[PDB]
């Protein structure tokens, strides 16, 4: 892009796509912070079977991914890429975007996340048998939350998470690069304008999102090997398309 008016138009445009595609409004999440699972409800979750809690989490991830697909569809540049590259970007990026969007549903004051209507701590997911992954996700959401990420910042940051020209498989790499650099300009322009450039050094390192995504795939492979009929019969088709 040439001149601040085109960059600023991009900023507004990205922010609007984000707002139209967030599953939960931020104030609905904040208004729920006192609604916290009782210890008896926590115990109830801990006693659910591994396979039932996997199914539930997969369903919830699938719904979050659907909103990310709509997000990508509303970024003009994205829908200008060829279909192969759209799919490449979405298969590598969708989970990373959801992982970023989850910080909004995380309360750093008590280390809880909004899940199935109330806030609960990481002990809520014990039945999954993936304590390392869960703990890493909570840690990631705590990092971002410490930054006090604004809605506008999440918009712009998650547009960049998705439009990543380093994804293996991209055919029009140069085109993705150009889009990535315009979105980087937009993000950094907005940071400069809002006096928020101090967060650049505090953003999680390159590789942290990859690490969560790869742990997620690794834990999935173990679960699937234990309960292959559950995955086939009861995991959402989109989930399996992205991760199995």
């Amino acid at each position: 892009y040439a001149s601040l008016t085109e960059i600023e138009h991009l900023v507004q445009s990205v922010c609007k796509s984000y707002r139209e595609t967030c599953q939960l409004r931020l104030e609905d999440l904040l208004r729920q912070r006192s609604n916290i699972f009782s210890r008896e409800e926590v115990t109830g979750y801990q006693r659910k079977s591994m396979w039932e809690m996997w199914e539930r989490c997969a369903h919830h991830l699938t719904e979050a991914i659907q909103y990310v697909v709509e997000f990508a569809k509303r970024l003009s540049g994205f829908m200008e890429l060829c279909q192969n590259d759209q799919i490449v970007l979405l298969k590598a990026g969708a989970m990373e975007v959801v992982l970023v969007r989850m910080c909004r549903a995380y309360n750093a004051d008590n280390r809880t996340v909004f899940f199935e209507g109330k806030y609960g701590g990481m002990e809520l997911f014990r039945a999954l048998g993936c304590s390392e992954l869960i703990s890493s996700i909570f840690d990631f959401s705590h990092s971002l939350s410490a930054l006090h990420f604004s809605e506008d910042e999440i918009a712009l940051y998650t547009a960049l998470v998705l439009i990543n020209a380093h994804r293996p498989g991209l055919q029009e790499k140069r085109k993705v690069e150009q889009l990535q650099y315009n979105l980087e300009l937009a993000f950094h322009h907005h940071l400069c304008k809002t006096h928020r450039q101090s967060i650049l050094a505090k953003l999680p390192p390159k590789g942290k999102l990859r690490s969560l995504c790869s742990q997620h795939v690794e834990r999935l492979q173990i679960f699937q090997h234990l309960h292959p009929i559950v995955v086939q019969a009861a995991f959402p088709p989109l989930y399996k398309e992205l991760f199995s």
Binding site: Q66, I87, E241
Partner: peptide, 9 residues
């Protein structure tokens, strides 16, 4: 396949 349908609709 599901992605392709979500992107097309």
């Amino acid at each position: 396949k599901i992605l392709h349908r979500l992107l097309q609709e």
